[PDB]
Amino acid sequence: PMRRRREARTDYHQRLRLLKSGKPRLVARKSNKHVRAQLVTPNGDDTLASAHSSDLAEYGWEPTGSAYLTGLLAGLRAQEAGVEEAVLDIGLNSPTPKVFAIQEGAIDAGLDI
Amino acid sequence: SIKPTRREYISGIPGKGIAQFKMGNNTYPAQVENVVEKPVQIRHNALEAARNAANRFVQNSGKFRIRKFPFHVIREQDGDGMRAPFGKSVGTAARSHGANHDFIAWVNPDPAVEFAWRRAYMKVTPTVNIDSSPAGNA
Amino acid sequence: AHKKGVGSSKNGRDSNPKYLGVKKFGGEVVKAGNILVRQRGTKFKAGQGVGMGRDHTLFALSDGKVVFINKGKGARFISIEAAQTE
Amino acid sequence: AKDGPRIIVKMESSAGTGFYYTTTKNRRNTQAKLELKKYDPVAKKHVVFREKK
Amino acid sequence: FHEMREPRIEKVVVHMGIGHANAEDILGEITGQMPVRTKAKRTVGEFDIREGDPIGAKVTLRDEMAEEFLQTALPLAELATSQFDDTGNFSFGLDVTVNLVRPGYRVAKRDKASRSIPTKHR
RNA sequence: AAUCCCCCGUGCCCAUAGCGGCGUGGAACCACCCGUUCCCAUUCCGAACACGGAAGUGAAACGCGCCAGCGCCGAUGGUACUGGGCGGGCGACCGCCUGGGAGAGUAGGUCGGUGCGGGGGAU
RNA sequence: GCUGACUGGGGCCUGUAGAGCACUGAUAGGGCUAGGGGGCCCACCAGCCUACCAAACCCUGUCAAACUCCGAAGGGUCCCA
RNA sequence: UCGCCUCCUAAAAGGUAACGGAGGCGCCCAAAGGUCCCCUCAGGCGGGACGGAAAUCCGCCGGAGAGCGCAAGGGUAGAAG
RNA sequence: GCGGAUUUAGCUCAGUUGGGAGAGCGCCAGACUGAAGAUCUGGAGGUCCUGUGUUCGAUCCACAGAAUUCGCACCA
Structure with missing residues (x-):
């Protein structure tokens, strides 16, 4: 096959799905413990720590809120940066109520999503 | 160097009906042997014969290993005259690639065999070269 | 009123695929590269493939057209240097 | 086209009468009388299209 | 680290x-993890040619529920040797494999x- | 604050990263974990996807490190093929002159390297 | 009106000749092996052994225009001369 | 024997006859269509029901060799699936 | 050498989902007769040509290759 293909679980490709364009893989990356999200925007882009459950201490609000806010937040540190409308990257999972969470994160953030 | 149709389509994948590869015997040293240097769709039958010929003149030790095999085929006459050629098949042969490792007479000391191949030699069809391998023959 | 057998006798016919434009030539939102028609073009150039490496054709405008799995559904952009402020 | 009383019969549809129609080929094959899909008569836009003919 | 090797229910x-x-309903009552799996072939050894038929039934039970069963039924079984096999697994009854x-x-x-x-850890 | 260890998401380089063999690590990390009213969810159980949390643990998927058995890569000189130019056989074909010059064949090589960020860890 | 065959350079294509085996189909000596054998308890025995046929995997070996993990010789084309 | 689809032949762009090689088509599929959501093959090995080729399930091994309506070639699981 | 068609139980014959096969005649047992025969009783019996191939599977579908029988064949 190909590396990722003999392996599995992944679909980094639907990642590509978005890669086409629409601005940035506002990518939610999750490992229950926490979540951390970055921004891969086309052109061998980069990022800007917009959201992580450790850039501001792993509270104790667990999922629900945790994601709510860290999201809103990322959205904002970001607009500070100067973006506008970003594009949703389901790092993985079926936009799990968790992702859902990060998601409204950008949502309310204002982060157009 | 024209050749066969499609080895599953004209005439492709046989058993070239012949007379196998090893008769003769063992040993670690003396390479006693036969190779040639002509170029040709080595004559199935012909060959087969020649070869078993040698066998005939001998019977045992002295590697009568024989490194040849007819695997493609000739064609001609079957239908209306001379213009449009459908295709009758005959002649299974192999490209004797202008010299190469033909058939061996391998063993420590059994000139009986050597001569024998010789025989097989005179036999064969395109002149062929009579010879020795990596050390000589004994 | 019919056809026969045991007479393969059957020519075939034409086609005309290609590497039309070839890599690194005056780019022009046009039939990019071809070996597979109902193509779905892509961005600037391509270089993924069943061999490894990658292709850069120093020419870009909107986009080009591909070859179903041959060549390479471009996407790894390269608008090329000659694409800076006039 | 090639009128084939074979499982291949030409047919078209109407926009509730958005007015005229549009082009389709079909098969008794499965589902007989059945034939509904939506379109856009010169009439306004969209509309319920029944296909039978 | 004996804290390893020494087991823990897995299938x-x-x-x-x-x-x-x-009949699979009977299964149903017996357990709680359905198993609609099509069976095959094409000949008459039981008049089984229809190459494509729902006919294979398999109530998968690992751990938990499988515990309810290992328990409830382990009694009705009666061999406890032989039907032990190699890859560390075995089977018996009208269709059982562990x-x-x-x-x-x-x-x-x-x-x-x-x-x-x-083949040194298993 | 803008020096190195480290893990974490993670990106380029399509096996000099894969295999597997031993090993090391949990504080920190991560997973495994616990449990299942409600989100959402299995054509069957929330095994996977799941929501909510300690304790338990590094076993398992996991990260560096060691090992060449497989595996991958891979040269020098080196042969065939040949671009071109001219000679020898009625011959299938032989040869020479002038740039190109694969694989395979022993060296030998490798068990990633490198992007950005986030957590720490170095007053 | 320097834009042309051509030559130097530089990308970027083809993938015959070659060559090779893991894709495929050949194929030969061979070994492991199980299918047929085949000789032995007569033999539902499915137990025994073994010198003939074999599939398959292995080592030694080979051929291919409609095979190719390999890969030129060269021709192509844009441009720079 | 006259049209079209694939392969070789085309001497490596693209492209050439031949009464040269082989082989398919004058259909279909209202859902193999659109898109969103999830699945990761054949095959081999080992172990059990009705099963002693040839399933069904379970546990390993796997440049995908299965697969795609129909023919060849291309592709390619990231999937067309 | 070209064409068309054919090779099934001993013999003459039948089938186009292909899906899983006889028709009548022959052959062994049972009668009916003192007997045999004609005649009622039962039965037993097939690579559907060789090898392939497409096929879930096709002898009924395809491709070579045997024998079948038939057509054919001129021009000066």
């Missing part, structure tokens, strides 16, 4: 499958670095 399968509609699980075990499912299960 028990209970079933049946006649070339044939509800699989031991030494600690190397799990590695085997990985799509990645799928270690060919070292």
